[PDB]
């Protein structure tokens, strides 16, 4: 189970339209590290957006000094920007501490001690299948989070508001080219 054959599954197989696998072989490790990192971050982001638009929110005040509740934070793109500056500073400080000490971003192979639910998959084919599942879900989540953000920007309403309004058909509505 080497890194070069991971992420090449059906139906596309080794899918490199740019041909960078054969002309830039030395940068593949860093590129796959970036791809896996983005995939994990985007999977977390997609789950977070699904949680937000379902109104699964904490009870209380995120910043009682600012008189701001968790429910006051928007469920769309502006939600992270609605957090107080001190809260954003704490979030980025903790995330940087994690990415520098606990899960060093310099660890390109992505093996941060833990495995899949804490277990190493001793079966080679099963290990490869689960790594490919991680990569494919990361790619799908990258596309999904990009689509969610772009759709929110274009429609001007969050995912929950868009779904409540019934704004699903891009053609019959009066907005945009269609």
């Amino acid at each position: 189970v080497s890194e070069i054959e991971l992420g090449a599954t059906e139906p596309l197989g080794v899918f490199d339209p740019l041909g960078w696998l054969e002309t830039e072989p030395e940068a593949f490790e860093r590129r796959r590290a970036v791809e896996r990192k983005h995939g994990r971050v985007a999977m977390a982001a997609v789950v977070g957006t699904i949680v937000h638009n379902n109104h699964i929110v904490f009870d209380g005040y995120i910043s009682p000094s600012n008189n701001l509740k968790f429910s006051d934070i928007p469920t769309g793109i502006d939600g992270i920007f609605s957090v107080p500056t001190a809260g954003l500073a704490q979030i980025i400080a903790f995330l940087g501490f994690v990415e520098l000490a606990w899960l060093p971003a310099s660890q390109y192979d992505g093996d941060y001690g833990v495995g899949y639910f804490g277990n190493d998959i001793l079966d080679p084919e099963e290990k490869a299948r689960k790594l490919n599942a991680e990569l494919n879900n990361g790619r799908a989540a990258m596309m999904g989070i990009m689509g969610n953000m772009v759709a929110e920007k274009i429609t001007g309403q969050t995912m929950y508001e868009q779904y409540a309004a019934g704004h699903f058909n891009p053609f019959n509505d009066g907005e945009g080219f269609f």
Partner: protein, 165 residues
């Protein structure tokens, strides 16, 4: 390096003013030719579809059980706003099914764009090699002409000027 490989014609031969394939990468040329042929087939379907949709020809019956019929659907981009949402989803789902499962090479073809897969064939082996190349060139050039034609039709729908008598 890329002369006379089905893109060359007597008026102009290998015509790559941008030099997008002049490097000589066979995989990139195959991808570009696949895109060109796919666009050409879609456009040569779209040209006749648009032409007979604007001519007033409509599929007989009702497009939906609620009462709306094919005759009520207008011509051009306005048609998409009047197709039932279930009907639009069914159209997109059928096209996606074709893209994912049907319109692809699974058994390996002798060139790019051959989707026969040994399942559906009308006797392409009856043609000789020159006739096969002639048919491929006809398909490709019809695809290019139809691409530009459907582009013109979609442009002039938005313009006040119409190219149809």
């Amino acid at each position: 390096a890329f002369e006379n490989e089905l893109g060359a014609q007597p008026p102009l031969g290998f015509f790559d003013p941008l030099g997008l394939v002049e490097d000589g990468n066979q995989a990139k040329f195959d991808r570009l030719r696949y895109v060109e042929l796919k666009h050409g087939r879609i456009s040569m379907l779209a040209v006749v579809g648009y032409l007979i949709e604007k001519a007033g020809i409509r599929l007989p019956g009702n497009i939906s059980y609620d009462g709306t019929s094919f005759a009520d659907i207008p011509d051009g981009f306005a048609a998409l706003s009047k197709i039932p949402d279930a009907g639009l989803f069914q159209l997109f789902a059928f096209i996606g099914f074709l893209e994912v499962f049907v319109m692809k090479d699974i058994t390996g073809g002798e060139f790019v764009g051959d989707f026969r897969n040994g399942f559906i064939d009308f006797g392409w082996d009856s043609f000789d090699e020159e006739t096969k190349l002639k048919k491929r060139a006809i398909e490709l050039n019809q695809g290019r002409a139809a691409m530009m034609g459907i582009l013109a039709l979609m442009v002039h729908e938005k313009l006040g000027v119409s190219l149809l008598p």
